Amino acid sequence: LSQVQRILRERFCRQSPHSNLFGVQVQYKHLSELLKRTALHGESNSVLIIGPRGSGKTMLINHALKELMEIEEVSENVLQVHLNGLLQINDKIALKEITRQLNLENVVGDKVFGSFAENLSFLLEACPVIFILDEFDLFAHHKNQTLLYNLFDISQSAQTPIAVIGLTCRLDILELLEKRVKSRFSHRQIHLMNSFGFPQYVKIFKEQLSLPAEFPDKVFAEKWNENVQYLSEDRSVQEVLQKHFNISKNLRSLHMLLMLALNRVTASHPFMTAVDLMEASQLCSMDSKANIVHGLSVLEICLIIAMKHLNDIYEEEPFNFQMVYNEFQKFVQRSVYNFEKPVVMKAFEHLQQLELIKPMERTSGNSQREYQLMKLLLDNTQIMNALQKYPNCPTDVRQWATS
Amino acid sequence: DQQTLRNLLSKVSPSFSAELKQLNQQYEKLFHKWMLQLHLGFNIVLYGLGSKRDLLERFRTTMLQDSIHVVINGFFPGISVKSVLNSITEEVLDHMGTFRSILDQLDWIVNKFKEDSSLELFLLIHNLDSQMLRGEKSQQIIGQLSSLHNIYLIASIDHLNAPLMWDHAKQSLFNWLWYETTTYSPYTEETSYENSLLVKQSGSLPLSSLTHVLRSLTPNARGIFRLLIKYQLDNQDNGLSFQDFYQQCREAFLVNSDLTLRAQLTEFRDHKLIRTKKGVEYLLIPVDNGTLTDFLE
Amino acid sequence: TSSMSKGCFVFKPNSKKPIEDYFNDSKLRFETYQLIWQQMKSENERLQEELNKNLFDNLIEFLQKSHSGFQKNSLREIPTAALVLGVNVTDHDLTFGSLTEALQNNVTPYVVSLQAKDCPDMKHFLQKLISQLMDCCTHYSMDSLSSWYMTVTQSPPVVVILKDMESFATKVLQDFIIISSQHLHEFPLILIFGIATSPIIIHRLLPHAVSSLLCIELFQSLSCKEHLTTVLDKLLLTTQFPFKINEKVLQVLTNIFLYHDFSVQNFIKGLQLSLLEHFYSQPLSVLCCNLPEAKRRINFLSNNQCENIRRLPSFRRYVEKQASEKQVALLTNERYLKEETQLLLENLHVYHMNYFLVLRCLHKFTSSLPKYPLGRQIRELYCTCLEKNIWDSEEYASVLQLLRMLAKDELMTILEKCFKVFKSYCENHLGSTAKRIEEFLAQFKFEVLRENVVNFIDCLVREYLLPPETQPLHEVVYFSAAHALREHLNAAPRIALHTALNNPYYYLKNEALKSGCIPNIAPDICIAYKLHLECSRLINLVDWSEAFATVVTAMNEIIHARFIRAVSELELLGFIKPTTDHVARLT
Amino acid sequence: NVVLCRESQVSILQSLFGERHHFSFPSIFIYGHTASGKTYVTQTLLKTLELPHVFVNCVECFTLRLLLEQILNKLNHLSSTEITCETFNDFVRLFKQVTTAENLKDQTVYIVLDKAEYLRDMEANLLPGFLRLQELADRNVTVLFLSEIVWEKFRPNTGCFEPFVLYFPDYSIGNLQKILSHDHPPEYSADFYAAYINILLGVFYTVCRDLKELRHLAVLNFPKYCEPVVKGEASERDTRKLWRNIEPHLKKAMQTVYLREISSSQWEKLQKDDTDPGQLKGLSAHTHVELPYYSKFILIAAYLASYNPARTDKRFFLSNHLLGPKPFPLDRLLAILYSIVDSRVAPTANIFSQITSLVTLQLLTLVGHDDQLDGPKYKCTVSLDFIRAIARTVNFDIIKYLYD
Ligand SMILES: Nc1ncnc2c1ncn2[C@@H]1O[C@H](COP(=O)(O)OP(=O)(O)OP(=O)(O)O)[C@@H](O)[C@H]1O
Ligand SMILES: Nc1ncnc2c1ncn2[C@@H]1O[C@H](COP(=O)(O)OP(=O)(O)OP(=O)(O)O)[C@@H](O)[C@H]1O
Ligand SMILES: [Mg+2]
Ligand SMILES: [Mg+2]
């Protein structure tokens, strides 16, 4: 009925736990081994889960921590400290957050501490502790990298079992760390490159749309799963998936496409079709700057054609309003499109407002609003395509632009 | 040559020795007329050829005996209007606290001294147009202090194009009376033989000059300058524009808006930390890359 | 004790405990100065109030109509007046002060004014604005402005006056307009711009997408030259104020005004400095006040003051007249001298009043004549006739010959103006001309009627427009120190360096110059400047050092070290710059 | 409140919102042009559906503290005082503390952020923090962004959680005529006002496609359009005579009231008295500035210096206007000033105060950001006819001396 909407909206909108991994089994076996070694035995480990954006890092660490925390022995003892690099941008905020996460707001009686090191040592003093330093590459931008130095230094066998799990998107995170924290770092890394060929991607597509086995009505479920099996083995759906595979390869963009297909199944239309996936692919793949030049009026289109004619002579030397207006006045002489300078200036400001033209000076004051050196931000082929899709371009303007 | 040798080798005897003494004895007559016109609202600027330091130091010992006065030496390289306003706040009014901005410290020092008009103060600026006290901001601060009824200012200018500093609003604020005093005393105190091609600098570019001017800077400004150092060290294998640098500060969590970065850059321009080699603009540091890598300890 | 690694020192008197002393009959000469100067200041600000009322009426009408539009509505386009003040920045503030009063009488209690220097960003702008609104009746936001307005009127518009329009940052101004346009139903805002040059600054400072949110109507302020003409008709060309200005000092002040900067306030500064220098010197200026009380002060004098009277040049030329009997009586007897000075001071006062009343009628004649060969303003006519005999010149002959061709139709209105100016001030000692103008006016062949009134005005201008130097005791109320005044007001520092290096003989007078000046010239700087002069934008330190040493000696260690001092000193004064050296700025 | 020509966008948005207890996209990025109903359709749709929402304008919130406190306080008025947070970490905790109320705990709480492009110039952590807020707080929250800028410019350098970008396409000519002709004045026919909008869009569409500006010009010129019908000159039926009247008046209105040289109120007050054209000068054509004598000569010397090449100085006194002004040092200004004026000039302090006073106004501009006091560099920033008028006033011929 509408339970399909609830379940698949929890699958795609937010990242809810779903049953099966996709080609990252070795990385999960490694990381589960590290965390079980830290949780049961007295070992301290540092890892860095390096991967592209939207390639399974947060999912894998949450799944590993859940599967570990199912054990009754670990659950009564272990403490989890979640830190996010976006939220905590100072040493004060980070240390206050660690204190609040460990629920030690009554062990400390607001006693000032000499250093961050002594404060962190006293908090760890007063039971293994697991850290998860999400957005790790933002923690590197601290003025003096005290948080990483102290965490890594304590993880060098200070008789407190601590696992520091960094999650970063940058593929050169190791070259940002300063010499100290790099030297304290235990050189163990887990890559998560989203490497799978196209048939595996099609198998992922046909499995995500499938419902779980548990559903209060099963006869609708088996029909829907048979429908998904039909959609997977169809040419036009495979053309859409081959077009989306060549760009992203990550499951988040596929989730967005699947949601836009899913959204338009009504009570009148209870089954998916290939037309839904084609129009969802059309919604995902729109070009932005072509839409912007689609919006523009005729007078601003004539200005853009004059800027293109200036770039095809001066070869990317910058321009001002006077040269553009001079070229446009060369066009309008040899009557319908004759306008005075303030109307053309009112048109020229609106291009700067849309960011199609940017000034190359970054002025502190003002430079007369004409005689200001500027740059177009479109290629020539973008302009030609955009004029091709323009609704009703007047014939003389098109003949001027083409020649 | 050496700076120590030149300071020891000044055993010269000027040719006109009595006529210069007669000249400097004529300007001691005018002091009473200068004391009248300060009390009526005017302010006095002294321009000439010699060094007016001795004349103003004769003025202070002759006239300003029973009055509070602040003696400001413009020639000392480590000075700004922040130092002067801190001096008046801590050592005259005795607030001895902390203010968020220098503009608000100006408003506090202006709403006191207006409440009690019995309190009086003199300023004696030995050189008003030295490199630190130039600029629209510093002259605006000094002009707003000078235009009150309880603060009197007397100054001396040396540079050739000095009246280019003040416009019609600043000339309204200061209200000058221009008095010419052309002594011939040498600038033995004013000039220091540094950045001079002929004499050795006792180290042309020591890192101590960088370290001392970075001790006055706020720590976040030290970070905004430290990032520029790190970007400088990797183009030694063959200029940074404002846009790229503003981006690099923005993801380093050091500036909010570009105006804060620009105002911070003016401080480095005054301290000579940065020189903008405009091509489209670019930013560069004059201190050499080897010495710059020798700064990171 | 004044030189240390500390930047600046604070010297107080520790455990320690007037103006007339610096002036040092200095006391009574100082009281007269304070009296006259506060009267001139009060009359200037009263004139400032009365001058600009005509535009304040239109501005108050525009604000009442605009807030009536808000009373219709509660879409709205932020009512704005682009008030075009002049380039004379120095005297804008008084105008805004007057305007801040005028609106506050009629339109609204809530008027605030913002200087551009106090608001670099949008936080400081709102902090200053909310502080001034809370003042007249902790992290402030725009919603706080609307909450304050809703609480305090538990009706009138809130008006802000942007003082100097050029020097706001662009971003603060656009953000304020965009934010304020959304909340016009809660916060009724009226903007007034202090435009200084031209309305086009709005287009330079606001794009078309923000200025379309404003409805702007232009206004004016009165031009500078009529404000100067009004303060000179009242503060100088009158007899209510005793102190007067010599013609050459007037030329100095109206050449600082007309060439360098339009500013009435600078002209008033010049009059204050003239008054102070006239009262500081001339101890006989004790007799410069309201003529009645001056005669009281004449009796209570000393012998030395009578000696100063006797030594005065104009009184010396007066006692040269009738040398036989009254001369020895005045030189021997102090009492006869005292009474004679009373008589001469009375004659000076009546000379002044007759002179100004004749001068206004001569101006009423020249006003009609469009050629204006003697000047269109009253002040330049006063300046051109004050030093030179007006009748003796060819200039008056030219204006007379152009005057004869005038017909009766304009000329009856001219005698109407002359009768008006005679009627405006009573108690004149000019009764005969006052009743002759009346008979010439209102007559019921025209040419013989016109020739007599022209010869009549010639008789008046010859009789009473004599220059003030041809009067006894003019020196007591006249100030002629134009050169020292000019060097105080406009001093050129870079012409007093060029005559202290090239010509050191002017200050050191010990035969140190012949025209090559001399080898034993003023210490170490003039040789460096003279040898520096010869290049073409190219100086080598080694060659310049050799050229210096080949003339100073006519050991080498002290010669070269003195050259180090000379090069560093000309670098301090800014003549040369580091870069062998190869720069000469003064080229 | 009616929504016309926007059926498809409303259908997509209403379907994406779903039922109340269901989840939705973490963030949506609506973009488009200047008047495409970005604010109108979103506010109307959210208000009619009766969903809880918080409408926040970013141009008002110029500080982190103001934006975060404004969102928190508008959420706290919807629960069933004056909570203050100064950091974004405090905002996440207080948002998890506020939304636990029973009104908001099941539904989808919407936070609309109008004018999102100013959010680009605030703190760096703010925009990826809002794009991921449903993950950070775990509280069923959706954050719309309404902007004019494409999403390409918004991307941070590392990357962020991608929002579903939605495009609001512009009104065409038929859509514009359907929007404008809806709220016809009731005294006249609907067809009459439709024909009026047709003759308006015939002459104003090539210049302007903005709905607000065209609507304001359809409000101003309408009483002049129905002037022949009230004086019995032509009936309501005959559109051709009415169009023949209204075409020259609209062509006059394009030059003056459209550019706001003539204000709207003054345009109405002229048009009621049949005196609109050429009677008011406007904000332009007031290029007359009353200057002192040496300010006039300094200003024309700076202009004549800044638009000549330095090679020709001996040829005149003793690459075009297209490129613009070229900066010059102080020394060349003083040399041309002494050569150009017949009277002998001393270099008094007031002349240097004048040179920096024109810089204090916007008649010159100092380009040198080096040591300003030793050799400043200046640049002239006034147009050609302003200098030609000044040179007319002091009777100097500026045209002969210019190189071009
Ligand atoms: N290798 C994989 N196996 C199974 N699911 C995956 C895999 N990669 C991505 N996904 C799915 O794609 C979505 C990616 O979201 P996820 O929370 O993993 O992003 P992330 O990369 O961990 O976080 P961020 O992008 O902020 O660094 C999740 O729903 C996850 O289930
Ligand atoms: N589809 C429509 N139907 C009816 N009226 C509309 C429509 N679109 C816009 N309008 C009218 O246009 C006016 C302005 O629209 P709106 O301000 O929402 O545009 P916008 O694109 O949000 O502007 P901005 O981009 O400046 O926020 C509204 O008052 C509304 O009445
Ligand atoms: Mg993640
Ligand atoms: Mg918007």
Author numbering:
A (entry chain D): 17 to 142, 152 to 359, 363 to 431
B (entry chain B): 268 to 505, 510 to 550, 554 to 571
C (entry chain C): 3 to 19, 25 to 31, 39 to 88, 97 to 159, 177 to 193, 212 to 501, 547 to 617, 620 to 658, ...
D (entry chain E): 6 to 85, 92 to 329, 348 to 433
Authors' account:
One construct consisted of full-length ORC1, but after expression and purification, ORC1 was absent yielding a complex of ORC2-5 (henceforth labelled ORCO2-5). The buried ORC2 WHD appears to stabilize ORC2-5 complex prior to ORC1 binding, hence we termed this structure of the ORC2 WHD the inactive state. Lastly, the ORCDNA structure contains endogenous DNA bound in the core of ORC and reveals regions in the core that are in close proximity to the bound DNA. These observations along with previous studies on the dynamic, ATP-dependent assembly of ORC suggest a model in which a pre-assembled ORC2-5 complex binds to ORC1 and promotes the opening of the ORC core to facilitate DNA binding.
The complex consists of six subunits (ORC1-6), with subunits ORC1-5 forming a partial ring capable of encircling DNA. All five subunits contain a winged-helix domain (WHD) and a AAA+ domain which consists of the RecA-fold and lid domains, although the ORC2 and ORC3 RecA-folds have diverged slightly and do not contain a lid domain.
